[PDB]
Design a protein around this ligand. Structure first.
Ligand SMILES: CC(C)CCC[C@@H](C)[C@H]1CC[C@H]2[C@@H]3CC=C4C[C@@H](OC(=O)CCC(=O)O)CC[C@]4(C)[C@H]3CC[C@]12C
Ligand SMILES: CC(C)CCC[C@@H](C)[C@H]1CC[C@H]2[C@@H]3CC=C4C[C@@H](OC(=O)CCC(=O)O)CC[C@]4(C)[C@H]3CC[C@]12C
Ligand SMILES: CC(C)CCC[C@@H](C)[C@H]1CC[C@H]2[C@@H]3CC=C4C[C@@H](OC(=O)CCC(=O)O)CC[C@]4(C)[C@H]3CC[C@]12C
Ligand SMILES: CC(C)CCC[C@@H](C)[C@H]1CC[C@H]2[C@@H]3CC=C4C[C@@H](OC(=O)CCC(=O)O)CC[C@]4(C)[C@H]3CC[C@]12C
Ligand SMILES: CC(C)CCC[C@@H](C)[C@H]1CC[C@H]2[C@@H]3CC=C4C[C@@H](OC(=O)CCC(=O)O)CC[C@]4(C)[C@H]3CC[C@]12C
Ligand SMILES: CC(C)CCC[C@@H](C)[C@H]1CC[C@H]2[C@@H]3CC=C4C[C@@H](OC(=O)CCC(=O)O)CC[C@]4(C)[C@H]3CC[C@]12C
Ligand SMILES: Cc1nc2nc(C3CC3)nn2c(O)c1NS(=O)(=O)c1ccc(C2CCCCC2)cc1
Ligand SMILES: *[C@@H]1O[C@H](CO)[C@@H](O[C@@H]2O[C@H](CO)[C@@H](O)[C@H](O)[C@H]2NC(C)=O)[C@H](O)[C@H]1NC(C)=O
Ligand SMILES: *[C@@H]1O[C@H](CO)[C@@H](O[C@@H]2O[C@H](CO)[C@@H](O)[C@H](O)[C@H]2NC(C)=O)[C@H](O)[C@H]1NC(C)=O
Ligand SMILES: *[C@@H]1O[C@H](CO)[C@@H](O)[C@H](O)[C@H]1NC(C)=O
Ligand SMILES: *[C@@H]1O[C@H](CO)[C@@H](O)[C@H](O)[C@H]1NC(C)=O
Ligand SMILES: *[C@@H]1O[C@H](CO)[C@@H](O)[C@H](O)[C@H]1NC(C)=O
Ligand SMILES: *[C@@H]1O[C@H](CO)[C@@H](O)[C@H](O)[C@H]1NC(C)=O
Ligand SMILES: CCCCCCCCCCCC
Ligand SMILES: CCCCCCCCCCCC
Ligand SMILES: N[C@@H](CCC(=O)O)C(=O)O
Ligand SMILES: CCCCCCC
Ligand SMILES: CCCCCC
Lengths: 280, 392, 82, 44
């Protein structure tokens, strides 16, 4: 998918407890302390000064006059530079494109009931295989809907996915993993970060009662126990994408604008509230 | 109702107390008994070992023990347990098709980071802090020394200018008047900017003291390859992973370490890893992954290796082999093994799996808040110092 | 908000917003009424977040990287699979 | 290519293909700039 960024992406750099204790408890306590220092300029002005210093954007403030008040403002400015450093240090990685899978799994409502969706879901599998038999046995309705958007081969399904004529491709897990690994640019990926449903295996078929069955089983088990299977998997099954800065759009960082909108609403509400208080 | 030994510790009278068994394998066994109607009678293996072919001290004889021995000697009839399918066991008993695919992996203790109170002073060495503190004041006094004796700034104004420029606070809105003081103050501002930027560039790194020292890159990492006294890594004694390590002629250098430290059962090994007695535990992917999911302070770090599957082993000539294998395959094909995974393995309470940079927490930066509190409790005295100064 | 307060001209408000967005200090004079003293400071936070987000990856976009040029021996995917 | 695998099995190392404080020497340049500023201020 193109991916998505959560509206709170700009807010996780600190935990909720840290945010609320800095901007409610610590800040108001420090503002009250600044007033106590200066008195011995309204409290709104002290809160305004501290908040402007939290992120110094040259916002106009009214500095206090007492020396102790100036010292406390200095240590608050040190706390503010700590806060800005910690917040901006990892902000770029936190506001990053997060890729969410289209479907959770084979039991998702998109597969089970594709009709109750304004855009239809296009998923299919090649016929005459184990996957088709499994889907027919488990989900007859899903298989009946799937037969319409059938496929001819693995490469045909892959190019259908690439162009856009098909959305999902249900197939053998190992072949799909190999295709995802060998794919360039990694536009194709299996959901669930390697989700496997039937979890069977590849076997060497033999006639019933064949004398070669026991010897072949023992030889294969010896191969897997000697590490040769790992070597073969590295030689053949491994791919490109397995071993694995962008422009910012409105959708990328819409949360900051959401915060600004909430502030616009709150400002209008408090304007009406102040008018009501003044009138009455 | 499963009748098993009472005391796990060796050298104790193992009374056969009837406990009760439940979980993945028990549910699978009940399903098997339902699909092919046979009656079962579960009983735990006498000794906690999974079972390997061992040389008894009576020479010229190899014996199977554990669950393998209990099945081969006729005491048992079917091993419904996470029995790994390997070549050594397959020669004597026949396994069904795997009902769970997994592999060996390494479980270690996830280091919880500790937040020192001097974390934010950590980026600068203490001599640098002292030097910058001295520099602030020498520049501050020299501003007013230059400004006062100027043919063309008081003490407080110069000090506040220097400190506010360093801290970026704007407390002192007093600019120097003499030219030389102008160049001196502006270059001091530049130096303060560079110092602040260099401090910032590593404040976050020094705030969280996490390094990938304990991170293990599978079994190919040197810390597993090269034994050491401190790095105590182990497995369950007398199990499938022990057979795998012994069989590997190339990895026998590891084996010399494995035999030194081994544990009676998986629970003891994971407890030892939790209590930092152990540095690494080699065990099956399923068990270690579930333990990491539930016991949240341990992490599975090793790259997956020796991919195999748990099999419901029976005797060499058992009438149920074909039917039990077919039943396992049928359960795999429909949504039964998935149900067992969901209800026994997939569930978790916390995973802590996120490659994003660590989120700052309250315990991580308590030093900053305590520094602000110290500023509060120093200013509360500075008020009295100021009034006393006003008295004189 | 300030003009219709129960108890800051256009140019001064313009300069306040511009100097808050990009910290230059041209905006002199904080908003008088409480209704504006909350919106203005939230706008200051918005400006800080925007500036920090723009700054965080400015050097990467100033000089383009070399993703494809970084060949890695014969294990290169553009070498292994031609 | 067998020699490559032998040398990566035996002759391979740890430091191959492999959070620091700042002392005064690291900050020598900025302090030298500040000293030059002091000297220029005095001569001016
Ligand atoms: C009245 C004066 C002193 C201003 C007080 C500031 C608070 C009104 C703001 C500042 C920071 C705000 C917090 C900043 C971030 C947190 C985390 C945030 O949790 C998340 O990380 C996102 C959760 C989600 O995805 O919905 C929830 C709000 C909250 C508590 C905020 C609650 C409101 C806060 C405390
Ligand atoms: C001045 C004070 C009183 C207000 C400070 C603003 C923030 C505390 C509020 C304003 C807007 C709030 C956000 C607006 C809406 C978003 C989306 C909202 O939905 C989700 O992100 C869920 C996942 C998804 O939808 O993709 C979650 C909260 C959150 C981050 C909010 C988090 C808290 C916000 C930032
Ligand atoms: C008075 C309040 C309740 C509404 C007006 C608040 C304003 C401050 C506007 C200005 C711009 C508005 C934003 C501009 C457009 C975006 C996209 C908009 O739709 C999308 O996210 C899809 C992508 C796209 O629109 O391009 C969602 C709101 C949002 C954040 C807006 C939120 C409200 C904003 C911030
Ligand atoms: C805690 C560690 C990091 C050392 C920090 C030192 C500062 C907290 C002290 C040391 C010297 C103090 C200064 C020394 C004396 C001056 C003059 C002094 O002049 C007055 O008392 C009258 C001020 C007025 O009313 O205008 C004012 C404080 C001040 C700036 C002091 C401010 C606070 C200072 C810088
Ligand atoms: C470079 C890109 C981002 C566009 C830059 C826009 C500026 C060139 C314009 C837009 C808005 C203009 C301001 C908007 C209005 C104000 C008030 C204005 O006050 C007046 O006396 C005329 C209007 C009135 O009667 O209030 C003076 C200009 C000024 C500062 C403007 C200055 C020039 C501005 C900033
Ligand atoms: C010391 C005199 C020349 C006063 C004029 C400049 C001063 C502002 C001092 C303050 C700190 C002094 C620095 C502090 C200590 C270093 C270490 C020192 O570097 C070395 O080569 C010796 C090894 C070491 O001690 O680290 C000497 C320079 C230097 C940069 C000093 C240069 C002169 C500095 C900048
Ligand atoms: C060795 C050590 N172990 C610790 N365990 C803890 C924890 C979690 C509870 N903290 N901690 C340490 O902080 C140290 N280091 S210290 O004793 O040289 C030291 C003490 C105090 C301060 C200031 C920091 C600013 C506020 C005022 C006190 C600075 C350095
Ligand atoms: C799957 O199997 C069916 C047969 O069960 C194939 O259908 C045949 O297709 C060929 C070529 O189109 C025709 O000549 C035959 O007459 C078809 N036989 C029947 C009974 O339909 C189908 O082609 C196979 N599909 C794939 C992709 O393997
Ligand atoms: C294993 O399963 C097969 C198939 O269900 C069983 O074979 C059937 O047995 C019944 C009862 O004797 C007969 O009526 C059927 O005709 C048999 N069908 C086949 C395919 O042979 C078999 O009895 C089961 N054996 C075990 C070990 O329980
Ligand atoms: C985003 O997704 C849509 C489908 O919803 C697709 O048409 C479009 O091409 C995607 N954007 C990109 C980056 O191509
Ligand atoms: C047997 O089990 C009981 C708990 O049911 C325990 O208290 C007792 O000590 C055990 N006896 C042995 C074998 O020591
Ligand atoms: C098992 O099922 C058969 C019917 O298929 C029944 O006749 C028999 O009594 C049942 N009991 C056993 C254990 O054979
Ligand atoms: C040999 O094994 C038997 C049975 O476990 C044990 O009783 C005996 O003490 C052992 N002898 C030696 C020399 O280990
Ligand atoms: C009239 C004011 C001139 C001030 C010159 C300051 C030069 C600072 C150099 C900083 C280089 C990073
Ligand atoms: C005079 C009261 C000022 C209160 C300022 C609150 C600003 C909240 C901004 C939140 C940004 C995350
Ligand atoms: N491994 C599968 C390939 C075909 C499919 O997945 O449908 C089989 O032999 O049946
Ligand atoms: C001891 C003085 C510390 C100043 C820190 C400025 C970032
Ligand atoms: C007034 C100086 C405060 C410094 C805090 C580190």
């Amino acid at each position: 998918s193109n991916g998505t960024v959560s509206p709170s992406a700009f807010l996780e750099p600190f935990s909720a407890s840290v945010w609320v204790m800095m901007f409610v408890m610590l800040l108001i306590v420090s503002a009250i302390a600044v007033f106590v220092f200066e008195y011995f300029f309204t409290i709104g002005k002290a809160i305004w000064l501290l908040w402007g210093l939290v992120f110094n954007n040259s916002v106009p403030v009214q500095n206090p006059k007492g020396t102790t008040s100036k010292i406390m403002v200095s240590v608050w400015a040190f706390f503010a530079v700590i806060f800005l450093a910690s917040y901006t240090a990892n902000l770029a990685a936190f506001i990053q494109e997060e890729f969410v899978d289209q479907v959770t799994g084979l039991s998702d409502k998109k597969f089970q009931r594709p009709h109750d969706y304004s855009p239809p879901f296009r998923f299919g599998t090649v016929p005459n295989g184990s996957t088709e038999r499994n889907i027919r046995n488990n989900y007859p309705y899903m298989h009946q809907y799937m037969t319409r958007f059938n496929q001819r081969g693995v490469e045909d399904a892959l190019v259908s996915l690439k162009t856009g004529k098909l959305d999902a491709f249900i197939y053998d897990a190992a072949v799909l993993n190999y295709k995802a690994g060998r794919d360039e640019g990694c536009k194709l990926v299996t959901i669930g970060s390697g989700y496997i449903f039937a979890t069977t295996g590849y076997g060497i078929a033999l006639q019933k009662g064949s004398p070669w069955k026991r010897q072949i089983d023992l030889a294969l088990l010896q191969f897997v126990g000697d590490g040769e299977m790992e070597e073969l998997e590295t030689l053949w099954l491994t791919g490109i994408c397995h071993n694995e800065s962008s422009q910012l759009d409105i959708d990328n960082m819409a949360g900051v604008f959401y915060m600004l909108a909430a502030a616009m609403a709150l400002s209008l509400i408090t304007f009406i509230w102040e008018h009501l208080f003044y009138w009455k | 109702i499963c009748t098993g030994p009472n005391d796990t510790s060796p050298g104790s009278p193992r009374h056969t107390v009837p406990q009760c068994c439940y979980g993945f394998c028990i549910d699978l066994l009940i399903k098997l008994a339902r699909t092919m109607n046979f009656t079962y009678e579960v009983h735990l293996v006498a000794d906690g070992k999974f079972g390997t072919q061992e040389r008894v001290n009576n020479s010229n004889k190899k014996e199977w023990n554990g669950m393998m021995g209990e099945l081969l000697s006729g005491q048992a009839d079917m091993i419904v347990a996470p029995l790994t399918i390997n070549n050594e066991r397959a020669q004597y008993i026949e396994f069904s098709k795997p009902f769970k695919y997994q592999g060996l992996t390494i479980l270690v203790k996830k280091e919880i980071p500790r937040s020192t109170l001097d974390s934010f002073m950590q980026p600068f060495q203490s001599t640098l802090w002292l030097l910058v503190g001295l520099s602030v004041h020498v520049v501050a006094v020299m501003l007013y020394l230059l400004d006062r004796f100027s043919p063309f700034l008081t003490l407080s104004s110069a000090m506040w200018f220097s400190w506010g420029v360093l801290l970026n606070s704007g407390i002192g809105e007093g600019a120097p008047r003499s030219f030389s003081a102008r160049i001196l103050g502006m270059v001091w501002a530049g130096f303060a900017m560079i110092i602040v930027a260099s401090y910032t560039a590593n404040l976050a790194a020094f705030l969280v003291l996490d390094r990938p020292e304990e991170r293990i890159t599978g079994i190919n990492d040197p810390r597993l390859r090269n034994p050491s006294d401190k790095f105590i890594y182990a497995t369950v004694k007398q199990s499938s992973v022990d057979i795998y390590f012994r069989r590997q002629v190339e990895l026998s250098t590891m084996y010399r370490h494995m035999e030194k430290h081994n544990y009676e059962s998986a629970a003891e090994a994971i407890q030892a890893v939790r209590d930092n007695k152990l540095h690494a535990f080699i065990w099956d992917s399923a068990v270690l992954e579930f333990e990491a999911s539930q016991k949240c302070d341990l992490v599975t770090t090793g790259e997956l290796f020796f991919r195999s599957g748990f099999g419901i082993g029976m005797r060499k000539d058992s009438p149920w082999k074909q039917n039990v294998s077919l039943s396992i395959l049928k359960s795999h094909e429909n949504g039964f093994m998935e149900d067992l995974d969901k209800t026994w393995v997939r569930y978790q309470e916390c995973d802590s799996r996120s490659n994003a940079p660590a989120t700052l927490t309250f315990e991580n930066m308590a030093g900053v808040f305590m520094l602000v509190a110290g500023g509060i409790v120093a200013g509360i005295f500075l008020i009295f110092i100021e009034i006393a100064y006003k008295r004189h």
